[PDB]
Structures are given as structure tokens and as C-alpha cells.
Symmetry: D2
Subunit: 121 residues, 4 copies
């Protein structure tokens, strides 16, 4: 905060919550496929991307005693995992609608994290 | 799942994520008030309501090997905490806009949990 | 708090953290089995039991403006899910060491939750 | 995984769970001090360090489709926040025992993250 883009922050928080949920729902949807054995990296990466988006949403929602070093590090982590997860689910976009929808959510939240991170100094 | 209201489920998941975030933001907004000393139960209850809504959103987002006993217990917990937190922040609705907004989110998600729980058998 | 068993509380918090981790590790260990297709309810229940134990540990770690109604509801949820997950992984105790170890952690934390819940009035 | 130090990994997971809990307990203990108004950055940083340690413990507990890029990014975030939080609570080590205990937990988990991160390539 201070010279930050408040609208870029709100987008990042909203995209994190959306993306955590998409990833949780994708993990579960894949567990239910008969194809489950071939979708285990996707499921694992989804579990991670949901955990990190959850944490990132909470970190970014707070302004008291804001420390840009913590914020940048957390946004970096979230961008890195959303990129990994985006590609991972994108692999199954032609197999399952859940994975193409989740791939879009990862990429969208990767963009939101990157956009915010850049304007943090 | 099975005879469940899919739209009541989606509302519950959306309201949980909205409410977790509102509560996290309220906790932080109160930490920043000069009035902080008088707002410590509100801050604590917000932290709890954010933790439980987070968990509830994730539990309700999953359908593989669904167990209605776990689901009902988790929805019960989330309703109970949203009721407690709703009243707690509602106390400061005439002091801070963050608390009146958060009070509405708690009550809204309390309703969503109760509505879903009722149709689970 | 007030007439509560402080040692029963500490056990509950410690068992929750242990159990969240055991469940996360079990979920992942099962995703890696060649048997994964037959272990999907176990994996799902593990994900839920890790989420609820995480939340319960945090709720129980807090004493400011303690509300026994929220605490009991949250402990109830955690006991219910640990019971479900205990039985679920116990099914694979003769197939995988991870599931027999995780089954013991669920049962242990089910006991800790039940013991605490009983002395809360 | 592969050329990784399995004992450094277990330490990191254990220290994260310990540290998440210490931070949650410190946040709450500070909310209860009469001194609360002067301890608001400590409380905020504790909330963040608990969220990130929670996520890090879960990420590090998983081996299926392991991606060292995600793992390093997440460990980096966790080290950065534990360093920030260590110093933040260390400021009140002569005021409250909870803050000196929590400061030690942050520093300990900062070390565990840094040690692991270094051997990941
Ligand atoms: Cu975000
Ligand atoms: Cu995200
Ligand atoms: Cu996601
Ligand atoms: Cu999926
Ligand atoms: Cu998948
Ligand atoms: Cu994902
Ligand atoms: Cu994510
Ligand atoms: Cu994120
Ligand atoms: Cu992300
Ligand atoms: Cu993904
Ligand atoms: Cu996929
Ligand atoms: Cu996926
Ligand atoms: Cu999917
Ligand atoms: Cu898929
Ligand atoms: Cu995704
Ligand atoms: Cu995904
Ligand atoms: Cu993602
Ligand atoms: Cu994402
Ligand atoms: Cu993001
Ligand atoms: Cu972001
Ligand atoms: Cu909900
Ligand atoms: Cu909620
Ligand atoms: Cu809320
Ligand atoms: Cu507030
Ligand atoms: Cu408040
Ligand atoms: Cu709340
Ligand atoms: Cu809530
Ligand atoms: Cu909820
Ligand atoms: Cu709730
Ligand atoms: Cu509230
Ligand atoms: Cu309030
Ligand atoms: Cu509040
Ligand atoms: Cu507020
Ligand atoms: Cu307020
Ligand atoms: Cu609220
Ligand atoms: Cu609130
Ligand atoms: Cu609430
Ligand atoms: Cu709520
Ligand atoms: Cu709700
Ligand atoms: Cu709900
Ligand atoms: Cu517990
Ligand atoms: Cu537990
Ligand atoms: Cu467990
Ligand atoms: Cu397992
Ligand atoms: Cu399993
Ligand atoms: Cu479990
Ligand atoms: Cu559990
Ligand atoms: Cu628990
Ligand atoms: Cu439990
Ligand atoms: Cu289990
Ligand atoms: Cu199992
Ligand atoms: Cu299991
Ligand atoms: Cu297992
Ligand atoms: Cu197993
Ligand atoms: Cu278990
Ligand atoms: Cu288990
Ligand atoms: Cu369990
Ligand atoms: Cu458990
Ligand atoms: Cu328990
Ligand atoms: Cu417990
Ligand atoms: Cu760790
Ligand atoms: Cu940590
Ligand atoms: Cu900590
Ligand atoms: Cu503290
Ligand atoms: Cu503090
Ligand atoms: Cu901390
Ligand atoms: Cu931490
Ligand atoms: Cu950590
Ligand atoms: Cu850390
Ligand atoms: Cu700290
Ligand atoms: Cu402190
Ligand atoms: Cu602290
Ligand atoms: Cu403290
Ligand atoms: Cu202190
Ligand atoms: Cu600490
Ligand atoms: Cu601390
Ligand atoms: Cu810390
Ligand atoms: Cu830490
Ligand atoms: Cu650490
Ligand atoms: Cu670590």
C-alpha cells in the first residue's frame, strides 16, 4: 500500500478465492474420472495451487503493518504455482471441461498476481 | 449429493469464500482502528469465522465419496460461527462500515449454510 | 476456558496439527499408488479431514472472547470427520503402511476432540 | 525429491506446523494484552506467518508430480515471512513471554526453510 493499485489488489484477492475453489473442484472432479491414474500430477498441483491461493488471498486482504517484502514473496509464490497448475490442467482441456475451466482460472490468477507484483516497487 | 439442491450448494460455496474474505478484511480493518482495544472479541471471532468458512468451502466443493454426516457436521459448525460472528460485528455497525458490511456477509452465509443443511436429510 | 482442562486443549491442538499433516501425506501417498482408482474415497476424506483439522487447531489455539458454542461446534465437526477418515484409511491398513499410520492419527485425534468436547459444559 | 535431504524436508514440515500454531497463539495472546494498540503489526504479521506456514507444510508434504520450481517458490515465501515475523515478535520479547517463544519459532522455521531451499538445486 501507499502507491499501490487498489483495483489490482482487489482483483488479485478475488482471483485467488476463485482460483482456490476452481482448483479444489478440479482435484475432486479428477478423482472421480475413470481416467484418475493419468491425472495424478494435475490433482497434486491443484491441491498445492488451492493452498497457496488461499494463503495469498488472506495476506493480500490485510493492510495493518504492511511489509512489501512479505507481500512480493507471497505473490511470487502464487504466480509460480498458478503458472504450473495452468499448464498442468491445460493438458486435459480436450479430455475434461473441468480442466479447461480450471486452466483458465489459473492463467487468470497468474496474470492478476504478476500485474500486482510488478507495481509493488 | 443425490437429492440435493445443486444451486443451494453453489451458493453455500460462494458465500463461504466471500465470507472468509470479509472476515479476514474486517479483522485487519479493526486492528487498524484507534478503537482496537474494544474490538478484540470481534477480531478473534472474525479469525475463527474465516478459518471455518475456508474449510467449509473446500469440503462442500468435493463430491467424490461424499459422506452426508461429515458434510452436515461441517455445515453446522459454519452456521454456528457465522451466527456468532454476525452478531459480534453487528455490534460495531454504527462505529465502522467494515463491521456492518462483514455483519451482512456473516448473516448471509449463516442463511446459506442453514438452507443447505436442512435439505441434506 | 475457565473450568476447562488446559492439558486436554493442548493435546487437541497438537493432535489436530499432527492429523492434518498425516492426512495430507496419506492423500498424496495414495495418489502415487498404482491402486489409486480404488482409493478415491480415502483420498477425498483425507482432504476434508486435513482442512477441518487445520481449522480446528487454529480455533482451539485462541482464547480472546472465547465462545463455547463455536468451540463445541467446531470440535464436533472435527471429531465427526476424524471418525469417518479413520475408518476410511483403516480399510487399506493391510494394503499400505501410510493408511494404517494415518488411520491411527485419525482415531487419536477423534479421541482428543471427544475428550475435550465433553468437558466444555 | 530425488537428491533431496529427506530429514531436512521432515524438519521443514514439522517446523511449519509448529510455527503456524505458535503464530496463531501469539496473535491471540496479543489481542488479550492491555498493550494491544502497540502490538498491531505483530498481530498482522503473525496472521500472515500462520497462513503461509500452513500452506508450506501442505505443499512440502506432497511428492506426487513434484515440481521444484513451485517448491522453491513456496519455501522462499515461507522463509521471507518467518524472517519478518521473527523480528516483529522479537521486539516484544522483553514485554511478553509469548512473543519471545514465537520469535524463536519463526527463526527456527526460517532456518529450516533456508536449509531445505538451498539443497533443491
Ligand atoms: Cu490474488
Ligand atoms: Cu490464485
Ligand atoms: Cu486455482
Ligand atoms: Cu481436475
Ligand atoms: Cu486434473
Ligand atoms: Cu490448479
Ligand atoms: Cu492457486
Ligand atoms: Cu493467488
Ligand atoms: Cu496463484
Ligand atoms: Cu492445474
Ligand atoms: Cu487435469
Ligand atoms: Cu486440475
Ligand atoms: Cu479437471
Ligand atoms: Cu481433467
Ligand atoms: Cu486451475
Ligand atoms: Cu486446475
Ligand atoms: Cu491454479
Ligand atoms: Cu491459481
Ligand atoms: Cu493470482
Ligand atoms: Cu494474486
Ligand atoms: Cu458455504
Ligand atoms: Cu461462511
Ligand atoms: Cu465471514
Ligand atoms: Cu473488523
Ligand atoms: Cu471488528
Ligand atoms: Cu466474521
Ligand atoms: Cu465464516
Ligand atoms: Cu461457510
Ligand atoms: Cu459460516
Ligand atoms: Cu464477525
Ligand atoms: Cu466489529
Ligand atoms: Cu469483524
Ligand atoms: Cu470491521
Ligand atoms: Cu468495527
Ligand atoms: Cu462477518
Ligand atoms: Cu466480521
Ligand atoms: Cu463470519
Ligand atoms: Cu461467515
Ligand atoms: Cu455459510
Ligand atoms: Cu454454507
Ligand atoms: Cu484438536
Ligand atoms: Cu484432527
Ligand atoms: Cu488426519
Ligand atoms: Cu493415503
Ligand atoms: Cu488412501
Ligand atoms: Cu484423514
Ligand atoms: Cu482431520
Ligand atoms: Cu481436529
Ligand atoms: Cu478431526
Ligand atoms: Cu482417512
Ligand atoms: Cu486408504
Ligand atoms: Cu488416507
Ligand atoms: Cu495412505
Ligand atoms: Cu492406502
Ligand atoms: Cu488419518
Ligand atoms: Cu487418512
Ligand atoms: Cu483424519
Ligand atoms: Cu483427524
Ligand atoms: Cu481431533
Ligand atoms: Cu480436537
Ligand atoms: Cu516447513
Ligand atoms: Cu514456518
Ligand atoms: Cu510462526
Ligand atoms: Cu503475540
Ligand atoms: Cu504480538
Ligand atoms: Cu509469526
Ligand atoms: Cu510462518
Ligand atoms: Cu513454513
Ligand atoms: Cu515460514
Ligand atoms: Cu512474529
Ligand atoms: Cu509481539
Ligand atoms: Cu507475535
Ligand atoms: Cu506474543
Ligand atoms: Cu508480545
Ligand atoms: Cu513467531
Ligand atoms: Cu510471532
Ligand atoms: Cu512466524
Ligand atoms: Cu514461521
Ligand atoms: Cu520454515
Ligand atoms: Cu520450511
Amino acid at each position: 500500500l501507499g502507491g499501490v493499485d487498489r483495483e489490482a489488489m482487489a482483483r488479485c484477492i478475488e482471483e485467488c478465492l476463485r482460483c482456490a475453489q476452481a482448483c479444489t473442484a478440479c482435484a475432486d472432479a479428477c478423482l472421480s474420472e475413470p481416467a484418475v491414474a493419468d491425472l495424478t500430477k494435475c490433482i497434486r498441483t491443484d491441491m498445492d495451487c488451492a493452498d497457496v491461493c488461499t494463503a495469498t488471498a488472506a495476506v493480500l486482504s490485510r493492510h495493518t503493518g504492511y511489509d512489501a517484502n512479505v507481500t512480493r514473496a507471497v505473490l511470487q509464490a502464487c504466480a509460480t504455482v498458478c503458472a504450473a497448475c495452468g499448464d498442468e490442467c491445460a493438458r486435459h482441456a480436450g479430455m475434461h471441461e473441468h480442466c479447461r475451466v480450471c486452466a483458465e482460472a489459473c492463467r487468470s490468477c497468474e496474470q492478476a498476481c504478476q500485474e500486482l507484483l510488478a507495481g509493488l516497487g
